[PDB]
């Protein structure tokens, strides 16, 4: 239901997934040639089949493929700086693929929104879903849009006619947690006759 979910969520409202007490088979993921990009930092995805983690987490959203390269520790992404901050010492894997067939409409699909304004970058894995009208200066907006009174969000529109640099991409990022606690995820490789 993470990779074959029919709809995803917007980047400002990125869902928060917990994986524990189950066996993770990443071979189903990296063997399939249906994902545009496959980046893992500080960890070997092939060797993930015989390692254990205290807790494994996933995040899913849809953004532009050109914005994907922004997501990296030590780097700043225009969306990422206000939608998804990532620690420098992060360890995990990032996978993304195009969704032109399912996330593009001839008339456009404007239902997906995104955070646009804030006065400081958020902390790693910190979300902001407040709908309060952004203030561009000293004069209070008082909840009425207009000059210097900007709605905090805006939308994305996508069409099949959009090019490769314009098509939406479905993004999945995996984060692994290893506290001073027993692990909850194991691998099935050692099964034999």
């Amino acid at each position, epitope marked *: 239901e993470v990779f074959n979910a029919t709809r995803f969520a917007s980047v400002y409202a990125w869902n928060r997934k917990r994986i524990s007490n189950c066996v993770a088979d990443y071979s189903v993921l990296y063997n399939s040639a249906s994902f545009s990009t496959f980046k893992c930092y500080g960890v070997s995805p092939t060797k993930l089949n015989d390692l254990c983690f205290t807790n494994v987490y996933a995040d899913s959203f849809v953004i532009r493929g*050109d914005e994907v390269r922004q997501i990296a520790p030590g780097q*700043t992404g*225009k969306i990422a*700086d206000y939608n998804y901050k990532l620690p420098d010492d992060f360890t995990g894997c990032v996978i993304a693929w195009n969704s032109n067939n399912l996330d593009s409409k001839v008339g*456009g699909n404007y239902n997906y929104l995104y955070r*646009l304004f*804030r*006065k*400081s*970058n958020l902390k790693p894995f910190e979300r902001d879903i407040s709908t309060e009208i952004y*203030q*561009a*200066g*000293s004069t209070p907006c008082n909840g009425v849009e207009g*000059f*210097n009174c*900007y709605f905090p969000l805006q939308s994305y*529109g*996508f*069409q099949p*006619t*959009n*090019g490769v*640099g*314009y098509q939406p991409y479905r993004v999945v990022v995996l984060s692994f947690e290893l506290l001073h606690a027993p692990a909850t995820v194991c691998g099935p490789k050692k099964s034999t006759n």
Partner: antibody, heavy 117, light 109 residues
């Protein structure tokens, strides 16, 4: 009113190092996004850089090892320090303010620097 | 990268004459270009949002359209001060945003 107050440069040989500035007389600088402009005479206007409310910086290809931009909120002032100038760098340069990412609001009158013999 | 050309490179119109300026793209953008007005010795000025969204304080005589790659501008009733030059600017992505040839629109009185 809304207006931009710009520092002003001068005549400098190639490779010179200088710092400029621009204060926003319309709105508090910390509450908005802004930039500067490069305009080669009779050619056009080029994006160069921008600072973010989180302090983030972002350069153009030609200004990565050449230009640096800073801010003082108390002075309502956005700065710019240049280095490693070239002769062709002689061109009128303007200032950009972005009430929105997707456009432009108020142009500065521009500051000029000459690099010639 | 996206390459742009503005048509035409000069134009001849009278007072109130319908002036239509068009730019073309090589790649498919949806709503991320800007039409701007810049008189000589004068600063550029915001004209449109998206393709057909009016800005603040602009007379309704100014008009524009265009999507996909072919990108247009329109003046419903030409006005004497409209003697200027028109160009384009994209949104985000690379800094340069190259455009087409220079243009001179001439008023007929």
């Amino acid at each position: 009113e809304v207006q931009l107050v710009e520092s002003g440069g001068g005549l400098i040989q190639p490779g010179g190092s200088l710092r400029l500035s621009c204060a926003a007389s319309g709105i508090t600088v910390s509450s908005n996004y802004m930039s500067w402009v490069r305009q080669a005479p009779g050619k056009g206007l080029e994006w160069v850089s921008v600072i973010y409310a989180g302090g983030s910086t972002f350069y153009a290809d030609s200004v990565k090892g050449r230009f640096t931009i800073s801010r003082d909120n108390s002075k309502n002032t956005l700065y710019l320090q240049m280095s490693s100038l070239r002769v062709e760098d002689t061109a009128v340069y303007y200032c950009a303010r972005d009430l929105d990412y997707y456009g432009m609001d108020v142009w500065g009158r521009g500051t000029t620097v000459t690099v010639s013999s | 990268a996206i390459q742009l050309t503005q048509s035409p490179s000069s134009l001849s119109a009278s007072v109130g004459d319908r002036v239509t300026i068009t730019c073309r793209a090589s790649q498919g953008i949806s709503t991320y270009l800007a039409w701007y007005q810049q008189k000589p010795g004068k600063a550029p000025k915001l004209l449109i949002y998206g393709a057909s969204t009016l800005q603040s304080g602009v007379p309704s005589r100014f008009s524009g359209s265009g999507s996909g790659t072919d990108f247009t501008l329109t003046i419903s009733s030409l006005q004497p001060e409209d003697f200027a030059a028109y160009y384009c600017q994209q949104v985000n992505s690379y800094p340069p945003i190259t455009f087409g040839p220079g243009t001179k629109v001439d008023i007929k009185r």
